[PDB]
């Protein structure tokens, strides 16, 4: 076989899960957050996949 | 087989789940948030997939 | 087989779920949010798939 | 087989769900929000798929 | 076989999970956060995959 | 076989899991955080994969 | 002060919430159930406060 | 002060929450259940407060 | 002070939370269940407070 | 002071939390369950407070 | 002071937490379970407080 | 002071935590279980407080 990509690719066979991202956010997984009190200014309480590039 | 992509591709066979994103947000997964009190200015309480690029 | 894409593609066979996004938001998954009080100015309380690019 | 796309495509066979988006928003999934009090100016209380690009 | 990529690629066969990211965040895994009180200004309480590049 | 990459690639066969990242965050693994009280200003309480490059 | 009860009482002052039950069911709290498929004969899918005394 | 009870009482002062139960079920707390597929005959999927006394 | 109870009592002062139960079930706490597939006959998947006295 | 109980009592002062139980189940605490697949016949997957007295 | 109990009592002053149980189950504490696959017939996967007296 | 009990009592002053149990299970402590695969028939995977008296 032959393949040429510029990116971003994701090429496969017999594949149970696939995610391609440029951005941006993708949530595909099981996630449970239980929480009782959030205070403070300002605290990232429960972050799973996170990116902060403030300018 | 032969394939040429510019991106972003996601090419496969026999594949249970697929997500392609440029952006942007995609939520495909099970997610449960239970929460009782959020305060503060300003706190990201429960973030799963998150991207903040303020300018 | 042969395939040429510019992107964004998502090409497959025998595939249970598919999402293609450029944008933008796509919500296809099970999601439960239970919440009792949100305060503060301004706090992202419960974000699952999120993108903030304010200019 | 042969396929050439400019994007955004989503090409498949035997496929239970499909979403193509450029925009914009698409909601196809089960979603339950129960909520008791929202205050503050201005707090994103419960966001599932979200994109904010204010200029 | 032959392959030439510019990156970022992810090329495979017989592959159970795949993630390609440029960004950005991708959450595909099981995650449980249980939490009782978050205070302080400002403390990253529970971060799983995290990136902070404030300027 | 032959392969030329610019990076970042991840090329394989018969491969159970794959992650490619430039960024950014990717969470694909099982993660359980149980927590009772977070205080202080500001303390990284429970960080699993973490990167802080404040300028 | 003086008090004599036979039960079931609930006596208080300055009290934000009160429930007295003999029975029976009382639901006063925030509750969110999101659900996609229930099968089987017969499975209690999502029970919060539950009592089964079949004879 | 003086108090004589037969039960079940709940006597207090300055008290934020109170529940008295004989039965029976009382749900006063925040609860989020997100769920995707329940099968089997018969499996208690997600039970929070539960009592089964079949005869 | 003086107190005589038969039970079940719960007597207090300056008390943030109170539960009295004979039964029966009481749910007053924050609870998040996220779940993707339940099978089998019959398996208690996620039980928090649970009592089974089948005869 | 003087007190005579038959049980079950719970007598106190200046007390943040109280639970009295005869039964039965009481859930007052923060609880997060995230789960991806439950199989088998029949396996107690995730039990927190549990009592099984089958006859 | 004077006290006579039959049991089960729990008598105190200045006391942050109290639990009295005859039964039965009481869950008052922070608990996080994250889980990916449960199989087998039948295996107690993750048990925190547990009692099995089958006859 | 004077005290006569039959048991089970728990009598105190200035006491941060108290548990009285006859049964039965009580969970009041912080607990985190993260788990990836459970198999076998039948293996107690992760047990914290456990009692098995099958007859
Ligand atoms: C193997 C492969 C296969 C492949 N298949 C495609 C789509 C076909 C199609 C089939 C039917 C359609 O209708 C359409 Br539209 C499209 S792209 C693609 C790319 C590749 N590679 C780059 C792998 C080479 O490994 C080099 C590493 F050294
Ligand atoms: C400067 C910049 C540079 C940049 N470079 C990229 C790589 C693309 C690529 C990806 C994979 C490839 O193979 C190739 Br070739 C190329 S995205 C990107 C975004 C930015 N920004 C400043 C947008 C942030 O918005 C401001 C916040 F408000
Ligand atoms: C990482 C971080 C992230 C973070 N993110 C925010 C979002 C605000 C917002 C964003 C978007 C909105 O729409 C609104 Br309203 C509000 S505050 C904040 C604070 C922090 N930290 C300081 C902890 C770093 O610790 C360094 C060493 F200790
Ligand atoms: C500067 C920039 C740069 C940029 N570059 C991209 C890469 C595309 C690509 C992706 C994959 C590829 O293979 C190739 Br080639 C190319 S998107 C993008 C967006 C931006 N912005 C500033 C928009 C933010 O809006 C302002 C917020 F209000
Ligand atoms: C400066 C910069 C540089 C940059 N360089 C990249 C590499 C791409 C690549 C990746 C893989 C490759 O093989 C090749 Br070739 C190339 S992304 C990127 C983004 C930026 N920014 C300043 C955007 C941040 O936005 C400001 C926050 F508001
Ligand atoms: C502890 C246990 C508990 C347990 N509980 C069930 C509930 C069924 C049900 C109960 C109520 C309902 O309404 C329905 Br429908 C269904 S199966 C089960 C199995 C077990 N074990 C096998 C572990 C014993 O260790 C063996 C060797 F060590
Ligand atoms: C046999 C029995 C006995 C029993 N004993 C109790 C104690 C009360 C007490 C509690 C605290 C005290 O201080 C004193 Br004194 C007394 S409840 C109770 C319920 C039963 N049942 C068989 C009902 C189950 O229904 C059948 C299922 F379908
Ligand atoms: C046999 C029995 C005995 C029993 N004894 C108790 C103690 C009360 C007490 C509690 C505290 C005290 O200080 C005093 Br005195 C007394 S409850 C209880 C329940 C039962 N059963 C068989 C009901 C189960 O139902 C069958 C399942 F379907
Ligand atoms: C100290 C105490 C205090 C107490 N107070 C009650 C309710 C008053 C009330 C007050 C106002 C009302 O309106 C009502 Br109704 C009722 S029962 C009780 C029991 C006791 N003890 C047994 C402790 C003795 O320690 C012996 C150990 F050695
Ligand atoms: C046999 C039995 C005996 C028994 N004894 C207790 C002690 C009370 C006590 C507790 C504290 C004290 O100070 C005093 Br005095 C007394 S409860 C209890 C329950 C039972 N059963 C068979 C019920 C199980 O139901 C069948 C399952 F389906």
From Swiss-Prot, chains A, B, C, D, E, F, G, H, I, J, K, L:
Organism of origin is: Homo sapiens (Human)
User: Where would I find the sequence repeats?
Assistant: 1-12, 13-23
UniProt note: domains: The 'non A-beta component of Alzheimer disease amyloid plaque' domain (NAC domain) is involved in fibrils formation. The middle hydrophobic region forms the core of the filaments. The C-terminus may regulate aggregation and determine the diameter of the filaments.
Q: Which residues does the record give as Cu cation binding sites? A: 6
Which coarse location class describes where this protein primarily resides? cytoplasm
Summarizing the annotation, the consequence of altering residue 9 to T is:
In PARK1; no effect on osmotic stress-induced phosphorylation; increases oligomerization
Q: Where in the cell is it found?
A: Cytoplasm; Membrane; Nucleus; Synapse
Q: Which example biological process does GO assign this protein? A: cellular response to copper ion
What is the disorder linked to it?
Answer: Genetic alterations of SNCA resulting in aberrant polymerization into fibrils, are associated with several neurodegenerative diseases (synucleinopathies). SNCA fibrillar aggregates represent the major non A-beta component of Alzheimer disease amyloid plaque, and a major component of Lewy body inclusions. They are also found within Lewy body (LB)-like intraneuronal inclusions, glial inclusions and axonal spheroids in neurodegeneration with brain iron accumulation type 1.
Organism lineage reads as: Eukaryota, Metazoa, Chordata, Craniata, Vertebrata
Explain the purpose of this protein.
Answer: Neuronal protein that plays several roles in synaptic activity such as regulation of synaptic vesicle trafficking and subsequent neurotransmitter release. Participates as a monomer in synaptic vesicle exocytosis by enhancing vesicle priming, fusion and dilation of exocytotic fusion pores. Mechanistically, acts by increasing local Ca(2+) release from microdomains which is essential for the enhancement of ATP-induced exocytosis.
> So which domain of life are we looking at?
Eukaryota
Record GO terms (molecular function): actin binding; alpha-tubulin binding; beta-tubulin binding; calcium ion binding; copper ion binding; cuprous ion binding; cysteine-type endopeptidase inhibitor activity; dynein complex binding
Q: What is this protein called?
A: Alpha-synuclein
């Amino acid at each position: 076989k032959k393949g040429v990509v510029h990116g971003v690719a994701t090429v496969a066979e017999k594949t149970k899960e696939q995610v391609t991202n440029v951005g941006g956010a993708v949530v595909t997984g099981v996630t449970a957050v239980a929480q009782k009190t959030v205070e403070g200014a300002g605290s990232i309480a429960a972050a799973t996949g996170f990116v902060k590039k403030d300018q």
